[PDB]
Design a binder for this molecule. Structure first.
Ligand code: FMN
Ligand code: FMN
Ligand code: MN
Ligand code: MN
Ligand code: NA
Ligand code: NA
Lengths: 499, 496
């Protein structure tokens, strides 16, 4: 119980804790960062195997390690989310709802500022100027048709508004360009893109750092679409109940977590670019052609002894673009909806849907008082959700009554198949602007910048009057409470035991 | 194992030998308790329960719950279903579909008529008929009555004797020798019975309960009109089904059936039947008048086993049997019509409310068409068939995904269906009347619930694909995939 709480704030301890859970495999065989690491980890995601810690990567800095699947799922269904739950210090049986509830409580708690320290483990090794050689690290080629090797797939950028009011921590990919330059996207609706654009009106480049192997709770928050201007570091402290220990970078004054595995520092160039990508991505596809992206100059880097580089091998679910990102989006969307007065009691970005839809659980004993109907409700939800920072990331919304558990894909499918009426429940919103990464967009959607948004209504019409056409024929809903308890009571005595 | 396909009692014994059967010796109430246990068995994917000690029931009589439920062990999940066809425990949807389709291509093997058989060990005639002596369950709390037949099939015969039809249909208990159940006019029972209404006499009928599992499966299969189920079963298992004559009306039933009911379907007598939890997962509140089935005689084996199906949320036998049979029949219909379809699957999770069509991407381009035209073509062919009429929604997706895996179907629905281009409603095509989302407008018009969801990217109709799949199988060369599989144990995973 103590090991779990230290796991939230210490990546190295997090890894040791995974091993104690039996959720880590120590790979001592020599492995090739050219595709092999990426292949092993992909198979780990899809088999829901323990996270691999790679101890020996060919042609890499001696002692350097790689952690694959830092928040992959486990095969054991009772502990399937334990690796993700451990990012917040939660026990192994924690599930989606437990994680979301804790993420929301931290939103309403006052931030706990980071504790500034003079020294930290991240400073045990410092490479300055000409010592910087990113190619010495075990930088993987993650997919066969990738456009380059990716240094940052599981770290977050650290930048600061010029006025010093807003400390932004955000996860974004960074491709390896040469020994001291990286390149990665800065979509204008993400917070790095906004602050970076705050520096272009000052004639200066953006001072920048990236933390890799950062405190797991800090990494999760960096992958969370918190509202604009909100500092991620204070939300992490509030989430774990104590400040995140930080130190100053070696060359630009930004504060990064003190026990980070690897810290990069430099600046984001104002107009230099390099062809970046393509890369297998969260939607599950590898698109064929890359795009020019801003260059990240690395003036210095520091790392702990025997540094662990965590990676994410993006693709078909479930990987960290779903377990981390989708989870964080779900909790933010729940807060967005409830704050707007919408009758939503849970939101879940089904991992199986590759973070391309969110299922909203509708409190049916609140629906009647709205005096509305499917078409009006869908439009109201669309404006509210899609207009939020978190809701902008997700193109499809499914609305269903809270009689189903929206975290269970089988129940969501049951509701889609049996409740969505083909003529009445398909609400496209072609005027709402799209998130540009949605894989089914066509040339026309990309020219207008909209066309991909959808609300699928699974609320029967009578539910807007507080009624329901039929009861559910299931164990829970087709038998009286006294009989259900008797069956649950005697289950083992009938002869079933644990099955 | 092939014994199991032709012998319900051996099938039960085979399940126990597999470790897939729980013998319940605790006394249980057929009033709701048996249904509640079995419903939980479906949802937990537990072993099939055999109830030996049924309160208030005929001595020696037993009840088999979840005869075709799924198992928690994912490697053997479909073993109980597969054993209906004599297939091994690791058989999956595709193996089952392939075998059901080979059976369509073999010529039928007529049943072998015997004069004696185990089903005749006990005979009740006329006033001996007391259906209430059997462990007739009340399956759901709000059900309209107790159901004797949830896992048996009607046996009727054309007046010409050209067509012996076996069809699964529910039968509610009305009184000690009368039952009532639906005979929807598009089903084959309703067509043959309404051929008898043109004759002056009622429809002679029998129901086999605890029949040979292979016969039960076929009876739950929408084979074309005029096709005799019994001959298809023989072709499926490779040998005739042994059948004997009924004791009182000359209809022929399988010889080792657990329980055989005999009588006739009255022309115009009805009784308020239902409601009952149904395949779509819902219990609607009000019943309907349905034809009365008069039971003049019945026969059963010593210590008879009454199989039951507790309809509701998936997966139960309305999905594992019915859905599977529909999928195989739909694959045949589609391929016979020339559609470029290589697999069809009625996802159990969708409660037999949608069918996923796996599109052979290498044949699509030669059609020179597009999503709208293809969807309309698929709609006409599929919904127009006997099997396709049962399913209101079709999903078309390329065969790069495994359409039997709901996680992959969901990935495709979410990442390939464009909200503006891929939602093809067909409000003019007649509906299957049980579809739960129909409104008053559809039930008065007789149509409005049909839909085709297109998950084929537009470039696929030209034989192209916008992007490769980022997965282990599709993002790495074959040699690396082999090396990772070979050295998996060296890495430290050991069966992970
Ligand atoms: C492993 C992982 C990788 C991610 N990579 C990217 C990325 O490359 N580009 C991007 O725009 N968002 C990416 N995200 C999502 C962002 O981290 C997320 O939207 C976050 O809210 C951004 O922070 P911000 O709200 O301060 O902009 C990733 C998330 C995770 C979990
Ligand atoms: C367990 C089970 C129960 C079924 N119950 C019914 C039913 O009550 N009413 C009905 O119309 N069809 C029911 N069916 C569907 C029929 O068995 C199926 O449509 C079959 O093809 C009918 O035979 P037919 O083609 O000769 O009409 C059931 C199927 C199964 C597997
Ligand atoms: Mn932010
Ligand atoms: Mn038939
Ligand atoms: Na963030
Ligand atoms: Na049939």
């Amino acid at each position: 119980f103590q090991s779990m709480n230290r796991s939230a704030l210490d990546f190295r301890h997090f890894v040791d804790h995974l091993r104690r859970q039996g959720d880590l495999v120590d790979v001592h065989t020599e492995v090739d960062a050219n595709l092999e690491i990426g292949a092993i980890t992909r198979r780990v995601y899809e088999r829901r195997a323990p996270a691999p810690l790679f101890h020996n990567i060919r042609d890499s800095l001696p002692g350097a390690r790689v952690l694959g699947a830092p928040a992959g799922l486990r095969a054991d269904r009772a502990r399937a989310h334990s690796r993700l739950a451990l990012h917040f210090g939660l026990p192994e049986h924690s599930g989606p709802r437990d994680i979301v509830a804790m993420l929301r409580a931290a939103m309403r708690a006052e931030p706990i500022a980071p504790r500034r320290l003079e020294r930290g483990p991240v400073q045990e090794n410092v490479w300055l100027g000409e010592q910087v050689d990113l190619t010495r690290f075990p930088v993987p080629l993650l997919h066969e048709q990738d456009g380059g090797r990716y240094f940052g797939t599981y770290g977050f950028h650290v930048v600061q508004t010029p006025d010093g009011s807003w400390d932004s921590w955000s996860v974004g990919r960074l491709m390896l360009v040469d020994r001291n330059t990286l390149a990665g996207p800065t979509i204008p609706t993400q917070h790095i893109g906004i602050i970076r654009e705050q520096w272009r009106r000052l004639g200066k480049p953006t001072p920048w750092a990236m933390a890799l192997g950062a405190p797991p709770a800090a990494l999760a928050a960096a992958g969370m679409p918190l509202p604009e201007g909100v500092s991620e570091a204070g939300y992490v402290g509030a989430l774990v109940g104590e400040p995140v220990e930080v130190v100053r970078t070696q060359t630009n004054g930004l504060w990064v977590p003190a026990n980070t595995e690897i810290v990069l520092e430099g600046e984001i160039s104002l107009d230099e670019t390099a062809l970046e990508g393509p890369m297998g991505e969260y939607h599950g596809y590898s698109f064929p052609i890359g795009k020019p992206q801003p260059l990240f100059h690395v003036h210095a880097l520091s790392f702990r002894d025997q540094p662990i580089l965590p990676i994410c091998v993006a693709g078909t679910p479930p990987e960290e673009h779903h377990t981390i990102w989708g989870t964080m989006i779900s909790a933010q969307l729940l807060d967005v909806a409830q704050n707007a007065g919408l009758p939503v009691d849970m939101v879940w970005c089904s991992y199986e849907a590759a973070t391309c839809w969110a299922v909203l659980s509708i409190d049916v004993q609140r629906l009647a008082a709205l005096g509305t109907d499917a078409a009006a409700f869908a439009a109201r939800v669309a404006e509210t959700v899609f207009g939020s920072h978190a809701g902008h990331l997700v193109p499809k919304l499914i609305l269903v009554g809270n009689d189903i558990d929206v975290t269970e894909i089988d129940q969501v499918v049951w509701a889609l198949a049996t409740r969505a009426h083909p003529l009445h429940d398909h609400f496209a919103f072609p005027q709402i602007r799209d998130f540009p990464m949605v894989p089914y967009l066509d040339a026309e959607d990309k020219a207008r910048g909209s066309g991909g948004r959808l609300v699928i209504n699974c609320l029967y019409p009578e539910q807007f009057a507080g009624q329901m056409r039929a009861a559910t024929a299931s164990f829970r809903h087709a038998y009286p409470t006294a009989l259900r308890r008797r069956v649950e009571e005697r289950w083992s005595d009938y002869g079933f035991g644990d099955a």
